[PDB]
Amino acid sequence: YEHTAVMPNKVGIPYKALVERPGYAPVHLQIQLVNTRIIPSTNLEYITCKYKTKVPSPVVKCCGATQCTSKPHPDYQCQVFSGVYPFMYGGAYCFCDTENTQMSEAYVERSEECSIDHAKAYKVHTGTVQAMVNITYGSVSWRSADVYVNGETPAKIGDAKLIIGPLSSAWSPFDNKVVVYGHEVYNYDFPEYGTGKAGSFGDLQSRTSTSNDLYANTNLKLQRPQAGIVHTPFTQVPSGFERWKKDKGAPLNDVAPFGCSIALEPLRAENCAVGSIPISIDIPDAAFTRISETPTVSDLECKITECTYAFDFGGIATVAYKSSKAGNCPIHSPSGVAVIKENDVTLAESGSFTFHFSTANIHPAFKLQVCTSAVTCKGDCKPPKQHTESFT
Question: Where does the UniProt entry place glycosylation sites?
Answer without folding.
Answer: 134, 271
